[PDB]
Amino acid sequence: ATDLGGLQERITTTTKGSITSVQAVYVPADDLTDPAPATTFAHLDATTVLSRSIAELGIYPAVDPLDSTSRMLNPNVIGAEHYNVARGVQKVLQDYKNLQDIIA
Amino acid sequence: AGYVSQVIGPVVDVRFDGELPSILSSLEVEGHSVRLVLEVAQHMGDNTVRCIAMDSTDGLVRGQKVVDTGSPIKVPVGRGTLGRIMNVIGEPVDEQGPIDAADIWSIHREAPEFTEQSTEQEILVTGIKVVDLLAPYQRGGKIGLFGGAGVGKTVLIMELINNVAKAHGGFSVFAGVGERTREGNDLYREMIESGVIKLGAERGNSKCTLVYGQMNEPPGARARVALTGLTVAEYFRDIEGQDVLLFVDNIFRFTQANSEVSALLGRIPSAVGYQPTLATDLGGLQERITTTTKGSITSVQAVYVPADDLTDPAPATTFAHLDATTVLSRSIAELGIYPAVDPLDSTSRMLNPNVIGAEHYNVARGVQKVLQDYKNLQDIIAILGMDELSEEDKLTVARARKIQRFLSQPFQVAEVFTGTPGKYVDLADTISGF
Amino acid sequence: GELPSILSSLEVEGHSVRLVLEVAQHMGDNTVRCIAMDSTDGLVRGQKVVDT
Amino acid sequence: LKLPTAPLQLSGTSAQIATLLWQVAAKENQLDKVQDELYQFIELFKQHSELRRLATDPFVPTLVRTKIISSVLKDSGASEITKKLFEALADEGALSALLEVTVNYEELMLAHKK
Amino acid sequence: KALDELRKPKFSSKYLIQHVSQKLIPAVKEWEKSYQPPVIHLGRVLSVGDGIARVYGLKSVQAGELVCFDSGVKGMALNLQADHVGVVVFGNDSVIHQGDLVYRTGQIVNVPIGPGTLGRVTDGLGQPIDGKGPLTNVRSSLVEVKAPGIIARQSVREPLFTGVKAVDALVPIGRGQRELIIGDRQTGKTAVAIDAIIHQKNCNEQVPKAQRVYCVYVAVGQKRSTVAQLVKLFTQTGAMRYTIMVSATASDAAPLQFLAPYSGCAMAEYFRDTGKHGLIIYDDLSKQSVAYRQMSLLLRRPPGREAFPGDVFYLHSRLLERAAKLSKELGGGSLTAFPVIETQAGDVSAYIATNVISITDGQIFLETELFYKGIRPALN
Amino acid sequence: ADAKALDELRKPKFSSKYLIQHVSQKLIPAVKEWEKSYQPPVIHLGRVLSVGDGIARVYGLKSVQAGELVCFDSGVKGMALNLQADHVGVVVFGNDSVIHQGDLVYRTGQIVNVPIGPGTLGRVTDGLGQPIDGKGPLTNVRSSLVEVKAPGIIARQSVREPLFTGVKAVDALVPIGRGQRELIIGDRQTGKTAVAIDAIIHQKNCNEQVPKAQRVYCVYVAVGQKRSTVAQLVKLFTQTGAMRYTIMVSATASDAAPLQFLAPYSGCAMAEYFRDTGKHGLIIYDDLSKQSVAYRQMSLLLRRPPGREAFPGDVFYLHSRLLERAAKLSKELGGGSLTAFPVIETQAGDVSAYIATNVISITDGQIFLETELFYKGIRPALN
Amino acid sequence: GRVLSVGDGIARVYGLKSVQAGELVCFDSGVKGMALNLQADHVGVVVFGNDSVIHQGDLVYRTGQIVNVPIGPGTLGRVTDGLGQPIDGKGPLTNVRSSLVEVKAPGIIARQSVREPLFTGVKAVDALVPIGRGQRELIIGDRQTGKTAVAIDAIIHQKNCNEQVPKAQRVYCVYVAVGQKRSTVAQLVKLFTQTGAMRYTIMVSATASDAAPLQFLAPYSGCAMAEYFRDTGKHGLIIYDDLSKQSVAYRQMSLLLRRPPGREAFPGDVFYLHSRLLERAAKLSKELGGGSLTAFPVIETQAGDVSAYIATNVISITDGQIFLETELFYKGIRPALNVGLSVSRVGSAAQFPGMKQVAGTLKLELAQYREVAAFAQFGSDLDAATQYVLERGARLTEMLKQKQFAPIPIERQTVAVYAATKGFLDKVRVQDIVAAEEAVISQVNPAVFKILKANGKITPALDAHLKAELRKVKLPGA
């Protein structure tokens, strides 16, 4: 955690300029509970999680819509017309997953 | 006569140029903020002993003088400890003066040997109907209490204390092994409120000695506080000749504390994560709870099951020692039945006709069969209809519905806030009633 | 002097039974490390061991 | 405080003592004086059983062991590097290192005579 | 041969040469002067690496005592061994070399507590990092304090309103208890904590001065941009008139992340001990646990389950039992802890999660499945 | 520092002796003034270097055998497990809280042995043969080793005699030969002990109807049990009369893990007396799964590398060298037998555990006792 | 140097003060060694052979040279051990040259993109997970799946293509057999001889009785023998059979050199063990010759558990993955390729253009087959087009089955998937689709295979001629 933190805390927008960082993170066996991804989850403003299940359906980019979070998803940051459609899309994709065990 | 050589966390090495103290002996660190007692764990060689502290080691200097007391940790025992709270090393933490010691006993002891044991295997009448009938308590046995929060566990604790002191004239020790201080203070004030602990001049009429090793104490202090409660109980057994009650609150926290002090002394952990000496560190406590020829100690130990996994080695090692379980249920308590003993999941080894007789055995098995027969048709009543099935099935519904009521009982320590007077029920009356 | 080779057989003199020791390692200080083919209950720490 | 530099470098904790004992003997040109001071203690352990008992027995008190060596290395044969080495090695019970601190001392000595 | 018993030596000390060296080199006729290594209140770094310094000497240092290196960087004497001290460094150990002088400061780890800490963002050791000058109206207090006993406490009766309907309806929280906000990542644990702090700001303007509740947010292992966003929200809300922030971030040393909850609890025990009411929030006690595991594996203490020490339960219980409600003869004050524990795919069977579940009174379990069903706060 | 270079230091190379003679006239008076602080030196005796976790390190004992009873001066026995170059690691048959550093250890000259014979018949002993029933010492008895090797291939014959248990399920369905080994494996509280107790009571009932050579002398080894359970069992065996033929070895839960590890070997040495002199023995190791746990404790306190579940790796050998002594001897060796009933407690019916599948691949059969048959009242709950 | 101690195939050596790390040393017993961890007091030397001939105080001489193997065209045809030395009984390696086994892989500027196709002859591979030249592809599977059989078919097929291509684009194969039986690899030399693939094949055989440093080092020796063809403009195919047995040989030395163990017991550098080796498989730039080296590491899983330590390392290193399943093996589907988990990261960049336009439809339909069969095995209901996709996907599943040692070239593979995806194998019963498609290859004219080989693509003037030729065939069942 301290090696990862000492790297991650230099990649900052300061008052001098800004660094927009895009880091790929490998999870070892499609396992987000491994300590090397789970440590770096606390350092990211926007964590796009790509899932194997989305990729085997052929949906590409295989971004997990529920599991991908951002700190830009507040309504006072990106407006309400963006926030409520994003939350509505997430709710429809979530209760579809709750139905999907009975469709199968 | 000895001086501190290493301080690594709660684990202190002391060096003695003369002769070494024995293992399990108590050492006093001379010159400190508070009383810092160490307990000798091993002789490391080169005139060093390895000790485990009973308080914080922050503020300890290599070369600090350490006085060997020549004995293990020695606690005050007797009737003067009743209604008091002690920590592991015997100091009063109830802030009510010193402790009137009848004697000062070593907390480390061998189990009562084979010639002293009782071969009788008799029942401890507790005055509680569901406990006396379905899951009886062995006099000298260990009883696992699977309660929790809001199932009336503390009322059951105080009623076992009350009824054992009332009926058999024995005293009780409560060993709060690793309990939170909010829960320990709640139990203290609830015992003062219910009259089983009295303060001031009426202190001799208390029935309970609290021995509290709190959760913020080091692992050596939580690992030994059950032995302090045992020593207080063993004085009442061996000198006073009583039927004592010991309450080891969360025996799993005793296990977890001894696992921590085994991990801190650099021992390789055994299965799942526990101490390699888990069975013997548990059996050293549980084998001193027995019936001697003088009296007995009956132990009511709350059991926590780690991952809802009964094959975990700490409950699998504890359940070898248990003679009864009394499972307290939330679903029993949400029918307004008090005490909330689950009448079907509670077991006892004392429930066979060679110790309680065929009369009591057949009454208990009939009651348990009737409640079971009602239990496995409630998915037939709620699905198909209440008056849907037979009259004989509704006869068992009515009989088990009134037996399920009849297991409830008003408690004598509950009358100061419920009004209803508590009623001790004898065993033969319970048999003839059910 | 002149250590036995690895896998060599060694006989312990004076044991209750015939104790053969197969050399497994050379430990480094004129010492070989052996595996007993029978029980070692009764071995005293000076016992004569004969290389075959 | 910088010493003479050793001729050859050696491994640790018994040849690390010899690397320093050589350096505080090449400061006073006592390289050949403390060498047979070492060789006489190799011989003294072959003679005396209560002197080798101060290097094998773990049950001799460390107060005794540092006060036999300090109470015989006086008024003759001191050299003040030998006299302070064997009272330092008796403090920590490291008198059994006297054989291999001697061997690695020669390996610095023989590379010093070139 | 009669010299075989001395063939190979055995040593009771890895630093044997460090004792022979202070007795051989002063024995030369030049160096009886002026060159004696002082060992009572001073030390020399033997080894340094990964934020651990093994220090020779320092004979009169106490366990847990704050020491100082000659490069200015501080440290805590954590292992006290027979021949050396194991010092955990409160900074980067790059400035520390072998042979550096280590002075003892004489004090165990202190923190400025008092009313001067309100509105200030400190690091894990109490030093301010917001750049508004030193702490003014304060006084030093110990960091490792004994928790109040049985008789110092009284029963929890007064409600502590979090402003969250799910909490204050279903999981009612009293002034003086410890509620564990446990859940997976990005499930709203910090949101429950920040809503509680902001709601105490709202309630503090309408109640008398004896009933106000002063918040402390401890940020262990977070990033400085998250802490800056949180200070920005606390300033734009107005919560900084009652909130201290103790921020040991990810780039800080592991002993600082270990000591930040203890320092923040020492700051909040000021309000507990002087009659007032506290609210301490240890955000990611998981990360404090990981930092303590780092320091203990690097000090080569024997590891237990998952890698953790034996006293990792004693760590969190010793910390969390300082959240109490005191008795009326001690002012009646209180301190309410909200530890935050991150779970991995929602198991409460992890080791530190089981430890804090055993320590705390209740729990607030936030489920990630309930998060995207619209239910926010996602309280199971 | 080469041994080639440490071998040349045996030869004298001082070339000046100006402080050989200086201290050799001064060494003895300096040693003499510290005699109050010298412990007497130890060569054939032993002195405890360090004691802890129930393992003492003993300096000296130059002539101890490996695997030998040593006696600490406080009267506690030990067993020299590993003789090292500098010390002897002994394993303390007792609590190590009475052993100090600097204590004297005495060699006894004999590998670990228990009293066997006709005079131990009727008695309740601990894991090392000392009686605990309080009726005096073991008389009419002799000493024999506890780690005897089992008989070989040529010393055996096949089991022919039928060893009645008295249980209808066992004698009808799972019948027991007289030199056999039968595992009683089941969960907790499934009637495992009850089958073995019924076998012992039935041998009492059959011993008074058979002519003096078809008699079976039982041994009950109670490892890791409670002491109250053992007291109740001795009361039952006494009042049924079965204690006339039973030896009762008990290393209870309070006892040291070396005693619990050793108690089945002690009971096996006591029952091998009846095997070796032509009679027939019955031995019940109740919870061999607790002897395995005590041996795991001893091994992890000896810092041996844990294997599966934490067990030392020779925990198969622990039970195999135990149960292989249950044999039926040939007619040239007397024709005696020894029937073993190991008992293994199983967790939730998991027969695929480590110690369970170890003892299954040692014993000649199994008696599985199920919780689902035991809860229904089908008792004995024989699967 | 003097041997201080010796045992378990490690000799701790006093002296040897100028020895390099990784340098070959020679004992006076004749047995070789490699200095692996240089320490301040001794050298840790792993012994290339039986350590029973080394004694305490034996003399160790340093050879001066890092470990090297004979490379060149004189290794073609021969069966060598873990370092070069031939074990087939045919004398020395004539026409050969020594070079180091641990060579740095070519960097960024030394490569170009993987564009030429590597035909394995296995149509479950050459359609769905195709393999380019310079691509490393993991053949991962459980215990007795078809892992070697996929790799032997890739080698035998290169013999069938080398007779037909010009001399520049011929692929020379190297099979590294690590930790196997010695008679298992004798069955492969017999198979490569009676097929004729041994003309182009090197076999590097470090069997189970060889020392643990000979099995650790044999993938590097085989990579060095195959890097000869990469560095001199030719094309190589290296197959490391059981890299999971090389890492057990590496774990044995690391635990006996007292390097501290990590996950399961493995050393920390066991990712660097395999990524040093698989990154040497490259497609070089045209400045360096345009040469190529294609790797096929084999990893054996335990119960289909790809979440292991060595399994997750090599999945992270290699481009593709051929995941073979033991439950698909017994359903009849052989090669037992899990088409839902098998990847190729090069993908459509380096496959056959004649099958790029056919096997795009093939994986598009088999993706639709998989989820509908999970529902229709319960037996709820069927929907006459859901009925179409689990009836069509059964035509394609039986189409991708194959026999043991018959690699199908590339044109007879793409005609068969053409006839299966252009509807010509509907209404043919599912039991003899494996038997119909010999008629689809034999009865269809042999000169239409030449046009699809020469064009490499289905031209518009060929689909109208081929689908006219897929109608004049006599299909069984029908």
Ligand SMILES: Nc1ncnc2c1ncn2[C@@H]1O[C@H](COP(=O)(O)OP(=O)(O)OP(=O)(O)O)[C@@H](O)[C@H]1O
């Ligand atoms: N009640 C709510 N309504 C809507 N959104 C919310 C609510 N609570 C939290 N969120 C959103 O959830 C996201 C993650 O929440 P938050 O960071 O507070 O939880 P966390 O568990 O602390 O996450 P992390 O562990 O990553 O810090 C935030 O972007 C926040 O905007």
Ligand SMILES: Nc1ncnc2c1ncn2[C@@H]1O[C@H](COP(=O)(O)OP(=O)(O)OP(=O)(O)O)[C@@H](O)[C@H]1O
């Ligand atoms: N055949 C039987 N008929 C009736 N009751 C029985 C029978 N066998 C055992 N019981 C009863 O079941 C209980 C368990 O018996 P037993 O002690 O033999 O089981 P166990 O396997 O030894 O359990 P543990 O190993 O935990 O002591 C005893 O209380 C006994 O009274």
Ligand SMILES: Nc1ncnc2c1ncn2[C@@H]1O[C@H](COP(=O)(O)OP(=O)(O)OP(=O)(O)O)[C@@H](O)[C@H]1O
């Ligand atoms: N395509 C195939 N068609 C029919 N049979 C096959 C096919 N592939 C493999 N087999 C059979 O499966 C068996 C196992 O094949 P193979 O030798 O490839 O196993 P493996 O995966 O290499 O496992 P191991 O390395 O343990 O041998 C072989 O005997 C072979 O006959």
Ligand SMILES: [Mg+2]
């Ligand atoms: Mg957060």
Ligand SMILES: [Mg+2]
């Ligand atoms: Mg039993």
Ligand SMILES: [Mg+2]
């Ligand atoms: Mg194969």
